[PDB]
Amino acid sequence: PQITLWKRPLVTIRIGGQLKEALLDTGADDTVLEEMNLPGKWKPKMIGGIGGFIKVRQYDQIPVEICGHKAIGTVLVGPNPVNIIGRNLLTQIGCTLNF
Amino acid sequence: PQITLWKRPLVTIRIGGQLKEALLDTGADDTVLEEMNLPGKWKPKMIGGIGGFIKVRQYDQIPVEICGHKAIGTVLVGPNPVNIIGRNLLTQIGCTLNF
């Protein structure tokens, strides 16, 4: 699709069998989801944003389906008001910015 | 142009006639700049993201040219390490996400 930015670019994703709403975020290096259970091992990590750093759980090689397009990559899980799909998965689905 | 997401989408902007590097950021509602002492009135504002809220200075109707595409709007000045161009200006330059 082509998505404009008059509203937040929120889309539906599927992960671990569940549907969620997530923000397509070109400013985010990483994908950060709200606290949730995901299968498999995770590693404690920290990541930083506009307000400072938080602790997250790092899950590797997690399948995520984003508007029907498939990605498999690192998903971080931690305290967050919005699910954010970052460049690590946006690149996998061939997402670009155009103007 | 088309900006891919293999690296951070950093581009040149012009503000106050001077050139800066800034992140095209579809996950940002607002445009938030590194510390700079713009003339004129401003208002305090709180903005948040991962890690919490920060205090910023809000300046209105500031011209910002993004890769030669002119915009004008609100800019917030804060302690962040990178300038971010958010949807308030991305919409003005006709920027879309495409995949």
Ligand SMILES: CC(C)(C)NC(=O)[C@@H]1C[C@@H]2CCCC[C@@H]2CN1C[C@@H](O)[C@H](Cc1ccccc1)NC(=O)[C@H](CC(N)=O)NC(=O)c1ccc2ccccc2n1
């Ligand atoms: C998500 C990770 C941590 C991987 N990346 C970022 O947060 C990066 C960090 C760099 C470096 C520091 C300066 C900021 C940049 C860019 N961000 C990415 C952003 O796109 C970031 C993503 C985000 C969106 C929503 C919540 C949390 C993170 N956007 C913001 O921080 C902006 C700042 C702003 N006011 O423009 N935020 C929001 O747009 C926003 C919308 C709604 C909302 C609701 C409740 C609480 C906060 C909040 N923030």
